[PDB]
Amino acid sequence: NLEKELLDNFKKNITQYAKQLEISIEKVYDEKGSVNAQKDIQNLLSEYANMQEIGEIRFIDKDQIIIATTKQSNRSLINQKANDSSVQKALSLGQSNDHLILKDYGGGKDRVWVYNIPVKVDKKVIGNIYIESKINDVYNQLNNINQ
Amino acid sequence: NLEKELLDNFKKNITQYAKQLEISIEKVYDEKGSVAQKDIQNLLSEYANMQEIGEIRFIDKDQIIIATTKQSNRSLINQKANDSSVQKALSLGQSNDHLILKDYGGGKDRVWVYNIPVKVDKKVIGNIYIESKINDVYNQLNNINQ
């Protein structure tokens, strides 16, 4: 059962980090209001994305506009619509969600775990944190030990 | 207590890898020997490729260091471990852990030391000693101000 255990531990880890980012962003809104908070989002995103297991974090507003990213090579996405059904689901339901994707970042299609956590202020959704996490590091290690 | 959760998560990961390595080593004893030894080195090496593991050593029941994953520590092979945590795992037949500070070249870093004994029949034949890079957790905690 080693595979399920390691994947669950990887996901649990990302989710506990992401929750604290969500709480952090919420506190900035509670303290500063929406106009001034929306400028402290980038630093939080970037601090969190330093973790080895996180590929990219985006913050997406209520209207599905990409506000910020931690990936400099994706600066062209800022102010575009996310056009992402999983993001729409989180925004509408106010619930987290997750799924696996294949994505080629330059080395061939890699397995990537996508987690969305909506950001709530006064119980209302204001946006969504979208995370691409490097779950292929788990699969790669399992293959290396023949499990 | 993000901090306790994240530390716990790291340690569970290590402990679940280390349990499978113990099982694998035990298997190779059951069904070969030693002298199993090349197969033991390959197992240690595969396991040490994970990012969060610094070094793995396999120590026999007389406390001799039999194998390491770290090239620069080959001089340790055939020496006594002279390590009280290793002695504890051998004597008690249960895992143990503790934190150390160790300077690998970049200054003293927090390192999590985990020992799991290896048993054949139900008798201790050795011990797996692991140094793990728990300072990756503390570094990230400080980076997010938690």
Numbering used by the authors:
A (entry chain A): 6 to 152
B (entry chain B): 6 to 40, 42 to 152
Please, what does the article write about this entry?
Among the 16 TCSs in S. aureus, WalKR (YycGF, VicKR and MicAB) is the only essential TCS involved in diverse cellular processes, including cell wall metabolism, virulence regulation, biofilm production, oxidative stress resistance and antibiotic resistance via direct or indirect regulation of autolysins, the saeRS TCS, haemolysins as well as other key virulence factors13. The sensor kinase of this TCS in S. aureus, WalK, possesses three functional domains including the intracellular kinase, the transmembrane helices as well as the extracellular receptor domain, the first two of which have been found to be conserved across the bacteria that contain this TCS. The other functional domain, the extracellular receptor domain (erWalK) is only present in the bacterial species (for example, Bacillus subtilis, S. aureus, Enterococcus faecalis and Listeria monocytogenes) in which this TCS is essential. Here we report the crystal structure of erWalK, revealing a canonical Per-Arnt-Sim (PAS) domain for signal recognition.
However, the highly anisotropic property of the diffraction data prevented further data processing, which was likely ascribed to the presence of imperfect crystals formed by a mixture of different forms (monomer and dimer) of erWalK6 protein. Further screening of single amino-acid mutants of erWalK6 yielded the construct erWalK6R86M (Arg86 was mutated to Met) that not only exhibited a single peak in size exclusion chromatography analysis (R86M in Supplementary Fig. 1a) but also was crystallized with the crystals diffracting to 1.7 Å resolution. The diffraction data could be processed and the structure was solved by using the seleno-methionine-labelled erWalK6R86M in phase determination. The crystal structure of erWalKR86M revealed that there are two protein molecules in the asymmetric unit that appear to form a tightly packed dimer. The biological relevance of this dimer is unknown; the erWalK686M protein does not form dimer in solution and the dimer is barely found in the wild-type protein when present in high concentrations. Each monomer adopts a canonical PAS domain fold with the presence of five central antiparallel β-strands in a topological order of 2-1-5-4-3. The ends of each monomer are two long helices, directly linking to the transmembrane helices, possibly bridging signal transduction from the extracellular receptor domain to the intracellular kinase domain. The mutation site MSE86 is located in the loop region between the second α-helix and the first β-strand with the side chain of MSE86 facing outwards. Therefore, this mutation is less likely to change the overall structure of the protein, but may contribute to the crystallization. In the ligand-free erWalK conformation, the binding pocket is filled by side chains of E91, R93, V149, Y165 and E167. The salt bridges between E91 and R93, K138 and E167, and the hydrogen bonds between Y165 and E167, Y140 and E167 stabilize the ligand-free conformation.
